[PDB]
Design a protein around this nucleic acid. Structure first.
Lengths: 308, 248, 149, 49, 49, 147, 235
RNA sequence: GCCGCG
């Protein structure tokens, strides 16, 4: 009793602009699908972005290089807007070596195996001295959403050499999404609506692939609605007492009082432990002395006690 | 700490601190200067017969009290005469309507009243005086950003502030730029002006990332590329929060 | 939009400079968008010079008389590439843009003269009931930051 | 003592009896309480731990 | 004075005023509703103003 | 465009100017001293301000004229500024009078009142002189609030 | 890493009465709560199959404004009362029902004629409290299955005014959702703190459990995407 | 002592 939209008449205005048309839609599904698709496209779309840079003679972002007109911060900001595509790799390294005069563009990046430069007229720096050369290594990763360079701390597990410059990562290919709903050309049906989505990206992602991925994401999220239903830790504790090397006369008395773990022992205050039979005042000092030998003073308070 | 009718073209009526020091600290207007003695004077244009000539007289506070002074936005014809017979004026600390042959001086421009800080607010005449005061005092606390971005709606005093503030690099014998770097600019001076002997070139050493008094960053980046002709007084590099020699 | 502000701060504070600057920024960015569009499709120079002249020849008896006839092609192309983000128009302090000039500047840029457009909600997709004032206002970041407070 | 200061912003999602407190502003106002909870849960026996 | 001091201000008052107003002609006129829930359904889906 | 200036503002301003010219010539006749003419000019300017504000409120209150199923009627305006003032969310009749109607007669160099008022609102510009007048009052208010 | 999204876990349900429900889902990726809530609300309110009365006929006075022969309730209240009664029709699209009564006592929905395919869920729902004192009241209503909500804008049926007078143009509320509301709040898991939590408050007129309503809406919205998820499917 | 913040 419902018509199913079919992706027809996908038309490519330019290498960046795109229009995607869904011809058959019901009376009110046009706006619902349009807004869901637009939010998904703008929110989460996999893309590739520059994550870190390493220029030869640079040390930090706030330096200058002889012969180049732009500061290193400007070079990083230019590299941030560079867009690439990679097939089957998520950790690509691009080497850029250029010596001479004039601008240095993404076109003179050394041609890797499968790394597509979408716009090779994207200038990133200038060289003004004749005997000046620029050599740099750019790391490109694949991600989902915006990730600042400061937030990532997991990369600090292994030390980084002085000179590895971190840039922020965008990871999102889609820049602008709009949509419109008009009347269909279907004359036999009473009244049908057609949805048109205009996209503006960085040239990285295919429009058809982007709409397909967004629809897949929406269906995967909705799959959880189709079936609702549903209607003492620190290791020094929890050890046997037979590791403190107590005295012979203290062996039976501890067992007599059902103290078999180190943790349960440290909860017994002095005033009542003295009332225990044949404890011995001098022997009470011995157990305290060996208990303080590990850093535990007698009389702590815990919150529970498992059998283990 | 009040605004005296003689504050017109000498001391800004808008720009002043808010809480304790209101009225005790002021800023000079754009055109105010000092006499040989030290009193504040302000430019005005002489009026001869009914025409408005171009010669400029600087009037002090005492002298302006007896002349009849016109207003900046008074219509004029091509010959310089007043378009309308009865024009607004200030005679002795007041304002009224006077005949076209009675005036003796005219305001030189429409920025005479407002200071350098308050002459940067577009559409100032549509703002409340106190809100304009807060805006003027708040412009001075802005922090220079990573990249300067010019104002889409400006006033035109931004070139003056950027150039005369001294943060930028301005040519003094501008010829043709020979070498440009993110740190240096080397210009070969054209032969038309040259000190005889030892030839001569001009080298500007831009000040790179350097802390300011308020712990912001003072940075200069070049504006010229290569072989680009440059004239005297042009900006070579723009300092903090400046775009192409214009305050941003 | 980039920033959303409260309109209730306008009438009780009497900042109509806010609204006039917003409209003027919208008009300037409209002209900039037009220039960037005619530059994107590699339109031949003469029509670009004519459009930029028309933009600069606006206003009611303005003392600025910039003429591109004396400009050669290269400088005009450089200027147009510099005006791509917008036309940096300027109003002197007490004698600046009037209402008619702002409205006709908006008209030249193919924008609504009322200064208000139709805004759609970004979360529900429903159009807001009344037209909303949208423009470009020049905002500053003061030195008062929570990192130091 | 046991006091802090910060800039206020608007939270419209709050209730009438609730306020928003940064996690950095806390963990500093509530240091002795956190010490007590750590010691009582057995996580850190000594106060130094 | 005893008057309430936690009262809606600014945007809350604007919203409550915009909600509780009438215009001579709008979408829906003299229409009969079984309750407020039908009113909310009619407004949200766009069949009434 | 949400601040609708009344269309008759220039007419009432013209009548006020004509009356003040008549009282000026009457003073020049010598039958009136300075005090009486000063009081009378303040009175006529205040009456003109009252009438201007009344006209602006009249044009802003029921500015909407929306037709119905039969003929057309007149009902409360949905102008955003009036919607703010009437709702009590922000603003009052005085500030709307400053925004659309004439700014009004105002002065405080020493507490006195100047003869000619500020005839220009905030929708239109203020001349250099009128802004310099408004500054006296703003400065006095700010200093009083501080002290 | 990529392509993998957070899926809500431990869906919470707070059943109220038999037609009021509050369903909480947590966590969802940032900005997904609003998308899902908006889409579900829109398709639950605008397009859902259902059945509600559409036409009425009262013997005697047939004008839109009628004296009602002294039935102590204006016929507008009659139309309002019969609007809200909910029915379940099985295997039929249009069906006629008749109610005839006499003698002092309110007329409820149970007192209408009973058909096998017609299953009325609120038989004690009262149309009116009979004619004043005692009298005979007879009426015939017609109910058809529809979609969403459609007001009585016009009849545009039969010829002249036969369909209006035989119908009186009662507003039809086909969709079995009395009220849908959604609220999106802050929720978090592990180090992540900018996560979204969805709360859905549903009330149905009946004939449909609110959980069944949400499940049906999810089903139709998901199968509206099979043209894009079929080939692009993991399984 | 000066400057600023509400």
């Amino acid at each position: 009793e419902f018509l199913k939209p079919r992706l027809v008449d996908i038309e490519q205005v330019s290498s960046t602009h795109a229009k995607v048309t869904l011809e058959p839609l019901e009376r009110g599904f046009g706006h619902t699908l349009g807004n869901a698709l637009r939010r998904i496209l703008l929110s989460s779309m996999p893309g590739c972005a520059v994550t870190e840079v390493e220029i030869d003679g640079v040390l930090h972002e706030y330096s200058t290089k002889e012969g180049v007109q732009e500061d290193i911060l400007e070079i990083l900001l230019n590299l941030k807007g560079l867009a690439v595509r990679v097939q089957g790799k998520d950790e690509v390294i691009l080497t850029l070596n250029k010596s001479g005069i004039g601008p240095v563009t993404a076109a003179d990046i050394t041609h890797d195996g499968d790394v597509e430069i979408v716009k090779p007229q994207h200038v990133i720096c200038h060289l003004t001295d004749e005997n000046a050369s620029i050599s740099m290594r750019i790391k490109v990763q694949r991600g989902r959403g915006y990730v600042p360079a400061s937030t990532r701390i997991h990369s600090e597990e292994d030390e980084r050499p002085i000179g590895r410059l971190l840039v922020d990562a965008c990871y999102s290919p889609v820049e602008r999404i709009a949509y419109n709903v008009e009347a269909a050309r279907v004359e036999q049906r009473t009244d049908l609506d057609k949805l048109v989505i205009e996209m503006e990206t960085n040239g990285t992602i295919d429009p058809e692939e982007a709409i397909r991925r967004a629809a897949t994401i929406l269906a995967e999220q909705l799959e959880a609605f189709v079936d609702l239903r549903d209607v003492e830790f620190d290791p020094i504790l929890l050890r046997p007492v037979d590791d403190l090397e107590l005295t012979v006369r203290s062996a039976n008395c501890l067992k007599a009082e059902a103290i078999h773990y180190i943790g349960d022992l440290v909860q017994r205050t002095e005033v009542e432990l003295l009332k225990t039979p044949n404890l011995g005042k001098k022997s009470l000092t011995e157990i305290k002395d060996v208990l303080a030998s590990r850093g535990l003073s007698l009389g702590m308070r815990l919150e529970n006690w498992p059998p283990a | 700490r009040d605004v005296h009718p003689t504050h017109y073209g000498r001391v800004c009526p808008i720009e002043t601190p808010e809480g304790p020091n209101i009225g005790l600290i002021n800023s000079l207007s754009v055109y105010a200067q000092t006499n040989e003695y030290g009193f504040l004077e302000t430019p005005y244009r002489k009026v001869t017969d009914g025409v408005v000539t171009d010669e400029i007289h600087y009037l002090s506070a005492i002298e302006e009290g007896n002349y009849v002074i016109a207003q900046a936005n008074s219509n004029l014809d091509e010959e310089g005469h007043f378009v309308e017979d009865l024009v607004t004026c200030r005679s002795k600390g007041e304002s009224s309507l006077f005949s076209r042959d009675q005036v003796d001086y005219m305001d030189v421009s429409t920025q005479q009243v407002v200071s350098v800080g308050a002459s940067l607010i577009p559409f100032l005449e549509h703002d409340d005086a106190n809100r304009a005061l807060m805006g003027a005092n708040m412009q001075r606390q802005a922090v220079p950003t990573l990249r300067a971005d010019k104002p889409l709606v400006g006033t035109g005093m931004e070139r003056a502030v950027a150039v005369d503030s001294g943060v930028t690099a301005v040519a003094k014998r501008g010829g043709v730029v020979q070498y440009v770097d993110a740190s240096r600019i080397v210009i070969k001076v054209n032969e038309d002006e040259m000190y005889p002997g030892e030839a001569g070139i001009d080298i500007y050493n831009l000040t790179k990332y350097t802390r300011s008094n308020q712990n912001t960053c003072i940075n200069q980046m070049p504006c010229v590329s290569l072989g680009e002709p440059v004239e005297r007084g042009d900006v070579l590099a723009d300092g903090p929060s400046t775009d192409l020699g214009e305050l941003a | 939009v980039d920033i959303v502000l409260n309109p209730l701060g306008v009438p009780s504070r009497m900042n109509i400079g806010q609204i006039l600057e917003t409209h003027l920024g919208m008009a300037a960015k409209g002209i900039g968008d037009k220039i960037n569009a005619m530059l994107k499709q590699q339109q031949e120079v003469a029509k670009l010079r004519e459009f930029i002249q028309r933009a600069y020849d606006l206003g009611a008896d303005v003392r600025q008389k910039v003429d591109l006839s004396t400009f050669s092609d290269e400088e005009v192309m450089r200027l147009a590439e510099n005006l791509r983000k917008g036309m940096p128009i300027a109003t002197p302090v007490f004698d600046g843009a009037k209402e008619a000039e702002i409205k006709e500047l908006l008209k030249l840029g193919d924008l609504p003269t009322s200064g208000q457009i139709r805004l759609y909600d970004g979360r529900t997709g429903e159009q807001f009931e009344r037209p909303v004032t949208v423009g470009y206002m020049y905002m500053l970041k003061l030195n008062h930051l929570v990192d130091d407070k | 003592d046991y006091s802090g200061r910060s800039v206020i912003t608007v939270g419209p999602y709050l209730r009438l009896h609730q306020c928003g407190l940064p996690k950095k502003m806390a963990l500093e106002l509530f240091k002795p309480f956190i010490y007590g909870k750590l010691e009582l849960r057995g996580l850190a026996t000594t106060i130094k731990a | 004075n005893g008057e309430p001091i936690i009262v809606p201000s600014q945007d809350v008052v604007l919203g409550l005023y915009y909600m509780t107003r009438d215009c001579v002609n709008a979408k829906g006129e003299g229409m009969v509703l079984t309750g407020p829930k039908e009113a909310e359904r009619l407004y949200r889906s766009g069949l009434a103003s | 465009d949400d601040m609708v200036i009344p269309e008759k503002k220039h007419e009432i301003i013209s009548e006020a100017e004509a009356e003040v010219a008549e009282i000026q010539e009457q003073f020049q006749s010598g039958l009136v001293t300075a005090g009486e003419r000063y009081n009378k000019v303040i009175d006529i300017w205040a009456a003109a301000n009252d009438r201007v504000s009344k006209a602006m409120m009249d044009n802003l209150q029921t500015e909407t004229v929306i037709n119905r199923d039969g003929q057309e009627e007149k009902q409360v305006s949905f102008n955003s500024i009036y919607m703010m003032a009437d709702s009590g969310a922000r603003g009052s009749a005085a500030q709307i009078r400053q925004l659309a109607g004439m700014r009004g007669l105002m002065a405080k160099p020493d507490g006195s009142i100047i003869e000619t008022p500020i005839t220009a609102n905030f929708r239109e510009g203020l001349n250099v002189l009128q802004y310099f007048i408004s500054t006296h009052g703003a400065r006095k208010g700010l200093a009083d609030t501080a002290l």
